[PDB]
Every structure is written in C-alpha cells, then in structure tokens.
C-alpha cells in the first residue's frame, strides 16, 4: 500500500499540504450561512461563465445529510461528495444504534474528525473543502450553524461565510448582524443572506441559490423568481 507521509511539518511549524488545501477553498464559489430567531438560511454563489447548463440535473450546492440537517461547502466539488456520503452513512448509523437522529454538533464533529484523519494518515492528501453545516436538533427549536475546515477544527457561528471573496461578505455580516437581535422572521433572514451575497456575486439572476431550514425537518429550496423578488426589492431601497 502507498504509505508516503504527504502532510508533514515544515521548519516554521506549518503543515503546507493543509494550508494549500485552504487555498483550494479560497478558489471555490462563495457560500454563506445566517441563522435567525427561528431558522437558518444557507446561501450559495454559482459562477456564470457556464451557460448552456442543465440546472435540473446538475449537482446542487446544498446537500441534505438527513431530513433535519443540511451541508453546503466551498472548494473541490469531487472532494465534497466523499464527505457528504460518509456523513449521510453516519446519520443513518446513529439513528440505528442511538434510536435518535444526530445533533448538528455531533454530525459536524464527525465530518471534522474525518477531515483531521486525512491530515495525519499516510498516502493521502487533505480534503480541499470547508463546510457549513446547519439544522435543528431533534425536538429542539434553537437554530444551529457550524463550520469545518481542512485542518479539522470546527466551531459554531451566528453567521459565517466561506469561499472566494468571503472576507468581503464577512465584513458585511460583521456590521449588519446584531447578536442582541437576530433576524426575527424567515423573510428578514433570507434578505440579509441575499444582501450579503450581492456584495460579491454580480447579477442576482441564476447566480444565487437559497435554502431555508426550519425546525422539525422543514427544509425547502427557493426558485429563481422567489429569489429574484428579494434582488429587485433590495436594489430599489438602495437607490436613496
């Protein structure tokens, strides 16, 4: 078996392969997560150098891990499928032994552990992927949003973004998000998420995806027209 230690320390104490995996994440399309008073919203950028696409069949950016948890990502697309598959299998395994679906924290902790294992195992390179994992714990109405990265560290966020130009949209969210008063409704939460993507995206046409998760396995994806209404409304208020 191929044994080579690919992820190793350098003289300055850095693991370059892990750090170069973060550069792959920086190249990926932007993804944002914002949690309100009673919901979490996941927004995702889709690059428009690809026309003649078939959006019916093309892999969606936000993936259901279970009926109550979702996972979006930034970075290598092929890599993300491996993490999503493993997560989906662990979700069913947890239901089987514990007789209770996973908590968002647990599912995040598992995915993060997989990423960490690929940073000190022989013959493998780290995942070129950072994830945003959102949902609601079983029989709980408190919104949950977590982030993971190639190194394996994970943490909880009131609102967070990853991918290209994420530092710009993080700047926006840092002044536009009040901890004392999170978006009270679904509409408010979606609007703040769309606003934040409009700082970076280009056109609000078929470039933005929005997915809303509410308590008790209530997940739905918005259509073009529904999202376009938020885009139209925001621009008219801007001209002031």
């Amino acid at each position: 078996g191929y044994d080579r230690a690919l992820s190793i320390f350098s003289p300055d104490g850095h693991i370059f392969q892990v750090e170069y995996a973060l550069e792959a994440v920086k190249r990926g399309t932007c993804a944002v997560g914002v949690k309100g008073k009673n919901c979490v919203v996941l927004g995702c950028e889709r690059r428009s150098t690809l026309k003649l696409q078939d959006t019916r069949i093309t892999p969606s950016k936000v993936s259901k891990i279970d009926s109550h948890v979702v996972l979006s990502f930034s970075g290598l697309n092929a890599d993300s499928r491996i993490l999503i598959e493993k997560a989906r299998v662990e979700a069913q395994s947890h239901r089987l032994t514990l007789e209770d679906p996973v908590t968002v924290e647990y599912l995040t902790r598992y995915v993060a552990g997989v990423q960490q294992r690929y940073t000190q195992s022989g013959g493998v390179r780290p995942f070129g992927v950072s994830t945003l994992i959102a949902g609601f714990d079983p029989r709980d109405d408190e919104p949950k949003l977590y982030q993971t990265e190639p190194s394996g560290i994970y943490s909880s966020w009131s609102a967070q973004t990853i991918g290209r130009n994420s530092k710009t949209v993080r700047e926006f969210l840092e002044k536009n998000y009040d901890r004392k008063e999170p978006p009270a409704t679904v509409e408010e939460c979606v609007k703040l998420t769309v606003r934040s993507l409009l700082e970076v995206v280009q056109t609000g046409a078929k470039n933005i995806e929005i997915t809303v998760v509410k308590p008790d396995s209530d997940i739905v994806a918005l259509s073009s027209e529904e999202i376009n209404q938020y885009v139209t409304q925001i621009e008219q208020e801007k001209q002031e």
Binding site: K64, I65, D66, S67, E85, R88, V89, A91, Q92, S93, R95, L96
Partner: protein, 195 residues
C-alpha cells in the same frame, strides 16, 4: 413472532401482524408491532427467529433510508423487494443465516398501483394478491381463494381480513393476542387503532 398476513386490493395493501411475543411458557408482551416503515409508501412486516427479525428489519430500513437521502427519491416497491430478496439470498449461504420471513406491502406512485411481495428466509420472492407466512397460510389461503375479488375497496379488504383473524382465533393452537393492522395507499401508511 408467528402470524403475518397481507392483502392487496384495488387501491391499497393491508398488512395484519400478531401482537404476541412468547418465550417459553410466558407471553412477555401483547402489544408488539412486527413491522418497519422502509419508506413513506413501503411497509415491511416480519416473522421468524428471535433477535434475527428486528435486527434484519432495522438493517433493511437503514439501507433504504440511506438510499432515499442520497438520491432524494423513493425506491419503487419492486426495487425494494428485489434488494431485500438479494440480502436474504446472500444470507442463506452465510456462516449464520438470517432466519426471517417478510411481507413487503407498497404503493407504486409512478404506476398508481398497490403491490404485495412475499419473501421467505431462503430468498424466495413472489408477487401476490394475498400472502401469509408460517402456519397462517394453511387456513387463510383457501379462505381468500373463495372470498377475495381483485376490485375490492379498502373497507371490503378490512372485512375480508376480519374473516381471516376470526378463523385463526378459532382454529390456531396458540394465543397470538390479536393483530395490528396497517394500510398502505397513495397517501402513505396509517394504522387502524380499533381492530
């Protein structure tokens, strides 16, 4: 375990399964639900060796639920039954085979048709208008050969099922403590509480 039945009518599949769990000379429970929902429009009842039954049922349930999440799609009753058959067909030549017999009742939403599959522990699959496992069949098959019609309603199917339970309660040696009845149709799976 012991008694599991199934009847396919015009617009639905009806599964009846005994409530008793007996070990030795003691009925340990009289409210046992010998069934697992594999998907929203597919239900599987089971009977056989202690431990094996639930372990197998839940293992299949986990696999179908995994498929549903992966593809964001519900497998057809025909597809689920074939997956289950193959697992039992593998099992029979293992070091320790699963000794479990199952009925799979489902509603195919693409065909708008009810479907009932009978599979034994060897991996022997057959589609049927009515089915049974164990000694139950020795009474119910002939009874259904006489009274069953293919165009019956769900209500007519329940009356036909009452006729089977009555016969079993009269002629079977063991007390099986009645049955839990469930209906599978276009709107999914629901339980009849007063039987």
């Amino acid at each position: 375990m012991d008694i599991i039945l199934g009847i396919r009518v015009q617009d639905s599949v009806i599964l009846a399964s005994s409530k008793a769990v007996t070990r030795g000379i003691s009925v340990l429970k009289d409210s046992d639900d010998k069934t697992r929902q594999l998907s929203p429009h597919t239900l599987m009842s089971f009977a056989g060796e202690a431990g094996d039954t639930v372990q197998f049922a839940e293992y299949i349930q986990a696999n179908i639920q995994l498929y549903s999440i992966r593809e964001d799609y519900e497998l057809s009753p025909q597809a689920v039954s074939s997956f289950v058959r193959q697992e039992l067909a593998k099992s029979i030549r293992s070091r320790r085979p699963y000794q479990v017999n199952v009925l799979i009742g489902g509603y195919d939403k693409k065909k708008n048709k009810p479907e009932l599959y009978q599979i034994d522990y060897l991996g022997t699959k057959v589609e049927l208008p009515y089915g049974a496992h164990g000694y139950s069949g020795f009474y119910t098959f002939s009874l259904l050969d006489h009274h069953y019609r293919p165009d019956m309603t769900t209500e007519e199917g329940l009356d036909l099922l009452k006729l089977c339970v009555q016969e079993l309660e009269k002629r079977m040696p063991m007390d099986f403590k009645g049955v839990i009845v469930k209906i599978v149709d276009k709107d999914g799976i629901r339980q009849v509480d007063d039987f």
